[PDB]
Write a protein that binds this ligand. Structure first.
Ligand SMILES: *[C@@](O)(CO)[C@H](C[C@H]1CCNC1=O)NC(=O)[C@@H](CC(C)C)NC(=O)c1cc2c(OC)cccc2[nH]1
Ligand SMILES: *[C@@](O)(CO)[C@H](C[C@H]1CCNC1=O)NC(=O)[C@H](CC(C)C)NC(=O)c1cc2c(OC)cccc2[nH]1
Lengths: 305, 303
């Protein structure tokens, strides 16, 4: 037993980190088959990043302007193109460590592992949740751009995040592997602010199911609710509304505990309206919202890859 | 910026994880060169684990009694010895993925990465600290025995932990890679208690510095304290004493923030005496003690 934030084993992604350099600008890229993916702003000088015209800056660059390195080994760039905010560089070598992979665009509330990475060298791995305001509460220093976030299902690596930006508030913002930002952010050297954040309701419920699985069920009440009623109430507390997908992915935990989703919602609603009354759940006075239902399953029942 | 519980990348260790089965008992082993290390209770039956006379059980075993699977390949055991609670199985094949490694014994309050692992397949990675009562607060389910903890310095993996046990309180116990338990625990099937768990003071102070580096300052105050008077109050709260070394290891964090160590101690003393009201620090409602000063430096230098 025990309940912790847990990243996926990172070896399959470590074998795909490389360093990409233009001029003196360096960052991380993701080497899959014979293509390297990285943030397009690598083509910018410091002064270019203030107000960049990426189409114009790229028109002046050739394959031979791009330094791609696995460790100290150079991979010759033989083609380049821009997709949204990500640069794609065809290299002359197929990465022999390429895992089975997909590119996915995750939803707010979903979690992923971030492989922290500097100059193409992995440095750490940790778990993150996409906040409803499309930031992540990460740990990123200078040179971290291009670091990726991923999930592993079976033996397939699902890439969902590539790092670009730190906001003034100290949270982080980035794109999917197709170069589309999560949230209303742009890759300019400017101070940008995220929408007001909210609590990830589906994850709080997951966490309550986790508590119940562990015999901690004082908070189960006698009421139920409609989904619409619950959503209208939850927004009054800065909680995200539930989708039908959210109800669906709570199913297994609902079946395992025998507690219908809408019953657990009525239980959570009472907690919001009346507070914890000095009690804890799983040892915490805070309701935790960065464990998805899959995370609860991974840690309460055990899953391998 | 930002501060997060972070484990080392696990690839170098994943390549060493294998599965070891004896009879009806299966757990994880660590494959380095031509040796696979695993917990020795893999040789016990249900009846045996109650009170195993391990040397007796071990001698009655043959090489072929041990099934070692590395992925889709089975490894041929050509020998077997025992070092304390760790069984050493010789195999006819060197692990080609063997990294540069050493076996170290970690000290209380130090952190390491755990590669959670089932049936020789890794399931996740997270960071832990060796607590002063020599338990760790982990996440370990059935078939997790043999999972290892480690640190990576440059390209050398320092193995420091192999998992054996979950105490009735839900915390976890294990050995170094020479088979010596951390703490007063024994690999028999009995309910075992640990000594009273104290709080790792130098780590709580480091985490408070991290909170300051990241914009959280509500807990600071104008007061200072002497080392001794801080230790008087801390021990009253079951916090480990702070040593002059500890003060010294915190120097870099004091420099960066401009808050003297004994000033941070005055803040911590007030937090202990007053609690946190309804406030949080780095998103936590509890004083965190599983981040070392180096964990904090490596994540907040330059911020
Ligand atoms: C290993 O996987 C066994 O090979 C496992 C560790 C996990 C089980 C679930 N959580 C874990 O961390 N260890 C054990 O199952 C054994 C270890 C001994 C050395 C054989 N048991 C315990 O850790 C255990 C026994 C026991 C008990 O026995 C009567 C009473 C209370 C608590 C308790 N823990
Ligand atoms: C990448 O490593 C750069 O390639 C870097 C991320 C790092 C920096 C430290 N923390 C991180 O997460 N990204 C940036 O520096 C981007 C670069 C492009 C223009 C997208 N910019 C920012 O992160 C950025 C600019 C800011 C600004 O404008 C002056 C004001 C306030 C915050 C801010 N952040």
């Amino acid at each position: 037993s025990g309940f912790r934030k847990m990243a996926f084993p990172s070896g399959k992604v470590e074998g795909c980190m490389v360093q990409v350099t233009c001029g003196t600008t360096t960052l991380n890229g993701l080497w899959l088959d014979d293509v390297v993916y990285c943030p397009r702003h690598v083509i910018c000088t410091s002064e270019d990043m203030l107000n960049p015209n990426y189409e114009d800056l790229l028109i002046r660059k050739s394959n031979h302007n791009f330094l791609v390195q696995a460790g100290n080994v150079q991979l010759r760039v033989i083609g380049h193109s821009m997709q949204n905010c990500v640069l794609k560089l065809k290299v002359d070598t197929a990465n022999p460590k390429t895992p089975k992979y997909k590119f996915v665009r995750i939803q707010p509330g979903q979690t992923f592992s971030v492989l922290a990475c500097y100059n193409g060298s992995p440095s750490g791995v940790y778990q993150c949740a996409m906040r409803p305001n499309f930031t992540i509460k990460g740990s990123f220093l200078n040179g971290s751009c291009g670091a990726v976030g991923f999930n592993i299902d079976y033996d397939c690596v699902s890439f969902c995040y590539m790092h670009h930006m730190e906001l003034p508030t100290g949270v982080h913002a980035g794109t999917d592997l197709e170069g589309n930002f999560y949230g209303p952010f742009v890759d300019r050297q400017t101070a940008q602010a995220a929408g007001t954040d909210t609590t990830i309701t589906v994850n709080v419920l997951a966490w309550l199911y986790a508590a119940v699985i562990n015999g901690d069920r004082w908070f189960l009440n006698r009421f139920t609710t409609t989904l619409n009623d619950f959503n209208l109430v939850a927004m009054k507390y800065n909680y995200e509304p539930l989708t039908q997908d959210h109800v669906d992915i709570l199913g297994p935990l609902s079946a395992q505990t025998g507690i219908a989703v809408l019953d657990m919602c009525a239980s959570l609603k009472e907690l919001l309206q009346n507070g914890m009354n000095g009690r804890t759940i799983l040892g915490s006075a805070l309701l935790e919202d960065e464990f998805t239902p899959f995370d609860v399953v991974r840690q309460c029942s055990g899953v391998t890859f």
